[PDB]
Scaffold this motif. Structure first.
Motif, PDB file in Angstrom:
ATOM      1  N   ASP A   1      -0.659  -2.884   3.268  1.00  0.00           N
ATOM      2  CA  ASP A   1      -0.490  -1.439   3.271  1.00  0.00           C
ATOM      3  C   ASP A   1      -0.503  -0.892   1.853  1.00  0.00           C
ATOM      4  O   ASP A   1       0.433  -1.091   1.090  1.00  0.00           O
TER       5      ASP A   1
ATOM      6  N   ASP B   1      -0.504  -7.361   7.663  1.00  0.00           N
ATOM      7  CA  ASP B   1      -1.600  -6.626   7.052  1.00  0.00           C
ATOM      8  C   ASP B   1      -1.218  -6.295   5.611  1.00  0.00           C
ATOM      9  O   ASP B   1      -0.167  -6.715   5.119  1.00  0.00           O
TER      10      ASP B   1
ATOM     11  N   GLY C   1       4.782  -1.862   3.014  1.00  0.00           N
ATOM     12  CA  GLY C   1       5.147  -2.633   4.193  1.00  0.00           C
ATOM     13  C   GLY C   1       5.914  -3.924   3.906  1.00  0.00           C
ATOM     14  O   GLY C   1       6.742  -3.986   2.988  1.00  0.00           O
ATOM     15  N   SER C   2       5.625  -4.955   4.695  1.00  0.00           N
ATOM     16  CA  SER C   2       6.301  -6.250   4.595  1.00  0.00           C
ATOM     17  C   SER C   2       6.159  -6.869   3.217  1.00  0.00           C
ATOM     18  O   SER C   2       7.022  -7.636   2.778  1.00  0.00           O
TER      19      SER C   2
HETATM   20 MG   LIG Z   1       2.173  -4.110   7.083  1.00  0.00          MG
END
Ligand SMILES: [Mg+2]
Ligand SMILES: O=c1ccn([C@H]2C[C@H](O)[C@@H](COP(=O)(O)NP(=O)(O)OP(=O)(O)O)O2)c(=O)[nH]1
Ligand code: NA
Length: 326
Positions: free
Chosen positions: A180, A178, A167-168
């Motif tokens: 991931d 969050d 993710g980010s």
């Molecule tokens: Mg994320």
DNA sequence: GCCG
DNA sequence: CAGTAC
DNA sequence: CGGCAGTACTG
């Protein structure tokens, strides 16, 4: 580097209103337009200058012109007063536009109303409990600690397990909504039935605090979505997503879980134009679809040992994670 | 909302 | 299945 | 006119 703040900030309000009211396709067009504006080198000044940019059409150009000349946007004044409340409600994890609109129709207006009178799913009660925390982004340093917590528990019972935060985080962002964590094993077999052991090692730690999505009964569980908190003082509850994949699907799973979401969708859309299909499992070729774009024939899975292979098979130049925000 |  | 989410 | 990504849980 946005050179059109005066425009986008106004359009974002409109986009979110359509989104929270369930007008998903109209909101999608706004998102594409808004981003396209974020990327344009200079302040758009002409109606014709607007149209030239992909993702902007006549109707969107007219609103841009209205903002440039008036300084205001007429539609923003006739946004329903339900919208801030709908937004309040659908920021509960597990409640979407349908639930928010139902709650609103039942007269609810505040989270106190929800707490005392609304019927909540198990997910939504967890979302409400963590309402503030789920709206926070953590510094990526904390995402690292969370990834390492999961990786330690996983490699504790199989040192062969590979764990990467996606993710980010993998796109290099300073903050993360969050964490991931993608997990796989380079022998294509031992990845099987390990949610069982992993989730239990993290529960005995006290690390996991709530489970949102976790189908632990059947044995073919692909994802865990839950809530964790690092030990000690000053720690907030954070969202944690874990997926476990077969090694053959690693590149496609990595690609998917790294995102961005709009990036995935653009890539998937491109594959579709080429008679191909891309998912978190596989890149496929010779996919047979009907006239509505619906899969009716499955096609062949293509070998994709790395992310670069996916780009290659799609006729695209490779893009580093940091270059995939759109 | 946009676009083929 | 519809709703929600990644 | 009509698609707009393609999946995985929940109940
Ligand atoms: Mg994320
Ligand atoms: O609709 C989606 C949502 C997510 N994804 C993929 C991409 C995304 O980067 C990845 C992780 O989902 P997150 O909800 O965690 N988004 P991201 O990590 O990019 O941002 P955030 O910092 O908000 O978590 O799942 C999709 O393909 N479609
Ligand atoms: Na929600």
């Amino acid at each position: 580097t946005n050179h059109n703040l005066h425009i986008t900030e106004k359009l974002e309000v409109l986009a979110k209103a359509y989104s929270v009211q369930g007008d998903k396709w109209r909101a999608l067009g706004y998102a594409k337009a808004i981003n396209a504006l974020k990327s344009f080198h200079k302040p758009v000044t002409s109606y014709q200058e607007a149209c030239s940019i992909p993702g902007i059409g006549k109707r969107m150009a007219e609103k841009i012109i209205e903002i440039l000349e008036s300084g205001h946007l007429r539609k923003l004044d006739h946004i329903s007063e339900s919208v801030p409340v709908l937004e309040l409600f659908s920021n509960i994890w597990g409640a979407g536009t349908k639930t928010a609109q139902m709650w609103y129709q039942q007269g609810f207006r505040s989270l106190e109303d929800i707490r005392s009178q609304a019927s909540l799913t198990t997910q939504q009660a967890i979302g409400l409990k963590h309402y503030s925390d789920f709206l926070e982004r953590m510094p990526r340093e904390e995402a690292t600690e969370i990834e390492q917590t999961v990786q330690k528990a996983a490699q504790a019972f199989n040192s062969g397990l590979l764990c990467v935060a996606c993710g980010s985080y993998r796109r290099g962002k300073a903050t993360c909504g969050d964490v991931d964590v993608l997990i796989t094993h380079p022998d294509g077999r031992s990845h099987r039935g390990i949610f069982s052991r992993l989730l239990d090692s993290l529960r005995q730690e006290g690390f996991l605090t709530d489970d949102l999505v976790s189908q632990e009964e059947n044995g073919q569980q692909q994802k865990y979505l839950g809530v964790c908190r690092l030990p000690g003082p000053g720690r907030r509850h954070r969202r944690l997503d874990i997926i476990v994949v077969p090694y053959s699907e690693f590149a496609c799973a990595l690609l998917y879980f790294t995102g961005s979401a709009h990036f995935n969708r653009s890539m998937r859309a491109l594959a579709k134009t080429k008679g191909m299909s891309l998912s978190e499992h596989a890149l496929s070729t010779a996919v047979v679809r009907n006239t509505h774009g619906c899969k009716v024939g499955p096609g062949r899975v293509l070998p994709t040992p790395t992310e670069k292979d996916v780009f290659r098979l799609l006729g695209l130049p490779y893009r580093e994670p940091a270059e995939r925000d759109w």
